[PDB]
Paper text:
[name] facilitates new-born humoral immunity by regulating Immunoglobulin (IgG) transport across the epithelium. In addition, it has been shown to bind to IgG and Human Serum Albumin (HSA) at nonoverlapping sites in a pH-dependent manner. Existing as a heterodimer composed of β2-microglobulin (β2m) and a membrane-anchored α-chain, [name] is homologous to the class I major histocompatibility complex (MHC1). [name] has been proposed as a drug target in the treatment of autoimmune diseases, in which pathogenic autoantibodies are detrimental to health.
In order to select compounds for crystallographic studies, active molecules were further tested in Saturated Transfer Difference NMR experiments and by Surface Plasmon Resonance (SPR), yielding an estimated KD of 80 μM for the highest affinity fragment, the racemate [name]-[name]-84. Chiral separation showed preferential binding of the R enantiomer. Competition of [name]-[name]-84 with IgG was tested in a FcRnECD–IgG FRET assay; however, no measurable inhibition was observed. Confirmed hits from the fragment-screen were soaked into FcRnECD crystals that had been grown under acidic conditions. [name]-[name]-84 was found in the conserved cavity at the interface of β2m and the α-chain, as predicted by SiteMap. Key properties of binding interactions include burial of the 3-fluorophenyl group in a hydrophobic cavity composed of Y26β2m, S52β2m, Y63β2m, L65β2m, W29α-chain and P228α-chain. The most visually striking feature of the binding pocket is a tunnel-like cavity that extends through the middle of the protein. The bicyclic ring of [name]-[name]-84 occupies this cavity, being involved in one direct and one water-mediated hydrogen bond to the main-chain of Q34α-chain. As the fragment was centrally located in this region, it afforded us a tractable chemical platform to explore the binding site further. We attempted to improve the affinity of [name]-[name]-84 by better occupying space around the 3-fluorophenyl group, which was nested in a well-defined hydrophobic pocket.
Numbering used by the authors:
A (entry chain B): 1 to 99
B (entry chain A): 4 to 83, 86 to 267
The structure:
C-alpha cells in the first residue's frame, strides 16, 4: 500500500533572532520508503543539511528527520519541500516559528 | 517495561547509492544501533557510542544482522515487484522478570507474517507469507538462529544495556515552552502551545479558558536530532479573546503541571 507523508517543520530550541539554532523537517507516516526532502531558505535549497536514519512506526509507515544549523532573523523565511510517489507535485510546508 | 526492538527493512530495487537492507535498533524511544548493507557493520548511535560495553558486543550485533540481511534478501527470490519487506524483532522484560518476544513482518507495508516461538516457525495467511516462510524454514539453522536471537540474545543485550547505559534512560530534560497567537481567517486567531527539547517523550498539553477546560487542541509530535523531542498543540479561538487562554504542560521532568501564559 501507499501512504502519503505528514510533514512537520520546527526549530530545536525556541527561535530567537540572531541566536544559532537547528531547523527540523520531520517527515512521517509514509510508504514506500523512497522520499526526497529539501530545506529551503527564502525558496533557495539549503546545501548543508543532515538527516537521521530511515525508521518506521508500529503501523509499518516510515519516518525520518532532516535538520540543519541556522540562525533565524526577522525577515528570513524557511520551508521544507517533500516529494513522494503519493504526491502529485512537491509539497512545501513553511516554517511557522510558533510550532 | 523497556523494549529492545530492531526495525529491519529490505527493498528489492534500492535507489543507487542507497542500501538494499538497513536496520535501526531501539532501546525504548532511543536509537542505539544503526546497520546497513553498504557499510556492513553495526554501529552505536548518539550517547550509546560512549557506553562502555563488553569487548565483543558490536561484533556480535554485526554477525547477527549480516545473517538477517541474507535472509531478507533471499525472501524476494521466493516471491512471484518492487517489494518492501519489514521486520520488527526484539523483546521486553515483562512482569516477573522474564522476556516477552516480538517477531512481526510486513510486505509492502501490510503485516503478513510472524515467527511462532512455540513451533519455531514463520507463519501467516498470505501465499507470500507461506512462500517466504518455506524458503526460510528450508535454510539450515535459520529457525534455530531466530529462536536464539529472540529468546536469548535479545534479553541478554537488553540486560547488558540496563547495566551499562541505564543513565541514558534516566535522562530528564524538561521542555522549554512557548505560547503564541497568530491571526487566521477573519474573526479568528490560532493559539499554539509548543514544547521544545524535552525527554522522555511522554508529555501532555492542554488549554484552559478562564481556568476552565478548553480542550487538548490539535497536537503534533516529533524528534530532534539528539533524540530529545518536540511537541505542539494548536487551538482556533476568536480574535481578541486570546488572552483568556493559557496552556498547561505535564512532563516527567516537572513535579507539577506548568501553566504557560501568552
Ligand atoms: C539523528 C536523529 O535524528 C536521531 C538520533 C541519533 N537518535 C534518536 N533517538 C530517538 N530519535 N532519534 C533521532 C531520530 C532517529 C531516527 C529517525 C528519526 F526521525 C529521528
Amino acid at each position: 500500500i501507499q501512504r502519503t507523508p505528514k510533514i512537520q517543520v520546527y526549530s530545536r530550541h525556541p527561535a530567537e533572532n540572531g541566536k544559532s539554532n537547528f531547523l527540523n523537517c520531520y517527515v512521517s507516516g509514509f510508504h514506500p520508503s523512497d522520499i526526497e526532502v529539501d530545506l529551503l531558505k527564502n525558496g533557495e535549497r539549503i546545501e548543508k543539511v543532515e538527516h537521521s536514519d530511515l525508521s518506521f512506526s508500529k503501523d509499518w509507515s516510515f519516518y525520518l528527520l532532516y535538520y540543519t544549523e541556522f540562525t533565524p532573523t526577522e525577515k528570513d523565511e524557511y520551508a521544507c519541500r517533500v516529494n513522494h510517489v503519493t504526491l502529485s507535485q512537491p509539497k512545501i510546508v513553511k516554517w511557522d516559528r510558533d510550532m | 517495561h523497556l523494549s529492545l526492538l530492531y526495525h529491519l527493512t529490505a527493498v528489492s530495487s534500492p535507489a543507487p547509492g542507497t542500501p538494499a537492507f538497513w536496520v535501526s535498533g531501539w532501546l525504548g524511544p532511543q536509537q542505539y544501533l544503526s546497520y546497513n548493507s553498504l557499510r556492513g557493520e553495526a554501529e552505536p548511535c548518539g550517547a550509546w557510542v560512549w557506553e562502555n560495553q563488553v569487548s565483543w558486543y558490536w561484533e556480535k550485533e554485526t554477525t547477527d544482522l549480516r545473517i538477517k540481511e541474507k535472509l531478507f534478501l533471499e525472501a524476494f527470490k521466493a516471491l512471484g515487484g518492487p517489494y518492501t519487506l519489514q521486520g520488527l524483532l526484539g523483546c521486553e522484560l515483562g512482569p516477573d522478570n522474564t522476556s516477552v518476544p516480538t517477531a512481526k513482518f510486513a510486505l509492502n507495508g501490510e503485516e503478513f507474517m510472524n515467527f511462532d516461538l512455540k513451533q519455531g516457525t514463520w507463519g501467516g495467511d498470505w501465499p507470500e507469507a507461506l512462500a517466504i516462510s518455506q524458503r526460510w524454514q528450508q535454510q539450515d539453522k535459520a529457525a534455530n538462529k531466530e529462536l536464539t536471537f529472540l529468546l536469548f540474545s535479545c534479553p541478554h543485550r537488553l540486560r547488558e544495556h540496563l547495566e551499562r547505559g541505564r543513565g541514558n534512560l534516566e535522562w530528564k530534560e524538561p521542555p522549554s515552552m512557548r505560547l503564541k497567537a497568530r491571526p487566521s481567517s477573519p474573526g479568528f486567531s490560532v493559539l499554539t502551545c509548543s514544547a521544545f527539547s524535552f525527554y522522555p517523550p511522554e508529555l501532555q498539553l492542554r488549554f484552559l479558558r478562564n481556568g476552565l477546560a478548553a480542550g487538548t487542541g490539535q497536537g503534533d509530535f516529533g524528534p530532534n536530532s539528539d533524540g530529545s523531542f518536540h511537541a505542539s498543540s494548536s487551538l482556533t479561538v476568536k480574535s481578541g479573546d486570546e488572552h483568556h487562554y493559557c496552556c498547561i504542560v505535564q512532563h516527567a521532568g516537572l513535579a507539577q503541571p506548568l501553566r504557560v501564559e501568552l
